[PDB]
Write a protein that binds this DNA or RNA. Structure first.
Ligand code: ZN
Ligand code: ZN
Length: 52
DNA sequence: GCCAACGTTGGC
DNA sequence: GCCAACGTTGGC
């Protein structure tokens, strides 16, 4: 839907820890104000263009 | 009950 | 139209 499930981004299991979306996550110390997937896990086909 | 990450929205 | 922010809820 937002995932094709077979590109590199869809197959990734590990958040990069360094992009703006990761730095937002509570797991990396952020405020959880943004709340999107890691930039490297944004489906290359289906994701909003601005999320890649 | 919590939570990942989606779709919606307000302010620009 | 963009995008920061956050209500939402399927899945756990
Ligand atoms: Zn990342
Ligand atoms: Zn994909």
């Amino acid at each position: 839907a937002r995932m094709c499930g077979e590109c590199e981004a869809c197959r990734r299991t590990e958040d990069c820890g360094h992009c703006d979306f990761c730095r937002d996550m509570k797991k990396f110390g952020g405020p959880n104000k943004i709340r999107q997937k890691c930039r490297l896990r944004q489906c290359q086909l289906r994701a909003r263009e601005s999320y890649k």
